[PDB]
């Protein structure tokens, strides 16, 4: 019904921060900027790296925000805003704890989960916490003590990936999510396996 109009990628800048688990989100942006020759430019008034493509004969924009990720709201705020793009027309890609490497999950709506960009968009957004999520598993370390050190570690060669696969898996069911199907992205996606 609503054609994705902005998919923003979740990560932290810097190279101390490259690579890391809580990147994923912003992977998967690179990932697929890469597949469809979109280059991503520096552009200081939305807070992030944009990128642009035509689908449908509609813009469609790419975004990872290089605020930390606790801000990442911001940059998510000041495009959208610009552009007058609703919550219901964007997804947001990040890495999740609850799903294992090489998962990859759609959901709608909901909380945050701990996830500190997750948070920041939802309360930036005017506490509207109906955009679509790509989720990809990073695994969980097994005790809420470790997840800090965990998020900000870089995974093994195995898990890594695990997680490069999930992301082709997702990058697999892009015409569905360009479209807003997301009953049809999720029967492909969900039955897939790493
Ligand atoms: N439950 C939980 N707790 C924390 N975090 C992230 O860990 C990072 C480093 O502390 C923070 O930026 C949270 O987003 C997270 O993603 N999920």
Same mark, same amino acid.
């Given at each position: 019904? *609503?054609?994705?109009?902005?998919?923003?990628? @979740?990560?932290?800048?810097?190279?101390?921060?490259?690579?890391?688990?809580? &990147?994923?989100?912003? @992977?998967?942006?690179?990932?697929?900027?890469?597949?469809?020759?979109? /280059?991503?430019?520096?552009?200081?008034?939305?807070?992030?790296?944009?990128?642009?493509?035509?689908?449908?004969?509609?813009?469609? %924009?790419? !975004?990872?925000?290089?605020?930390?990720?606790? %801000?990442? $709201?911001?940059?998510?705020?000041?495009?959208?805003?610009?552009?007058?793009?609703?919550?219901?027309?964007? @997804?947001?890609?990040?890495?999740?704890?609850?799903?294992?490497?090489?998962?990859?999950?759609?959901? *709608?709506? $909901?909380?945050?989960? $701990?996830?500190?960009? !997750?948070?920041?968009?939802?309360?930036? !957004?005017? &506490?509207?916490? /109906?955009?679509?999520?790509? %989720?990809?598993?990073? $695994?969980?370390?097994?005790?809420? /003590?470790?997840?800090?050190?965990?998020?900000?570690?870089?995974?093994?060669?195995?898990?890594?990936? @695990?997680?490069?696969? /999930?992301?082709?898996?997702?990058?697999?069911?892009?015409?569905?999510?360009?479209?807003?199907?997301?009953? %049809?992205?999720?029967?492909?996606?969900?039955?897939?396996?790493?």
């Amino acid at each position: 019904m *609503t054609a994705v109009q902005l998919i923003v990628g @979740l990560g932290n800048p810097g190279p101390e921060y490259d690579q890391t688990r809580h &990147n994923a989100g912003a @992977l998967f942006v690179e990932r697929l900027a890469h597949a469809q020759g979109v /280059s991503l430019v520096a552009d200081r008034k939305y807070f992030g790296l944009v990128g642009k493509f035509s689908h449908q004969g509609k813009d469609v %924009r790419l !975004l990872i925000p290089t605020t930390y990720m606790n %801000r990442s $709201g911001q940059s998510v705020a000041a495009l959208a805003g610009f552009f007058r793009i609703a919550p219901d027309a964007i @997804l947001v890609a990040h890495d999740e704890l609850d799903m294992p490497p090489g998962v990859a999950k759609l959901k *709608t709506g $909901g909380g945050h989960g $701990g996830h500190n960009g !997750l948070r920041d968009i939802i309360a930036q !957004l005017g &506490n509207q916490n /109906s955009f679509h999520r790509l %989720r990809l598993g990073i $695994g969980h370390p097994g005790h809420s /003590s470790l997840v800090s050190g965990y998020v900000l570690g870089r995974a093994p060669r195995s898990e890594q990936e @695990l997680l490069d696969t /999930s992301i082709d898996f997702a990058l697999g069911v892009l015409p569905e999510m360009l479209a807003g199907d997301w009953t %049809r992205a999720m029967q492909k996606l969900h039955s897939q396996k790493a």
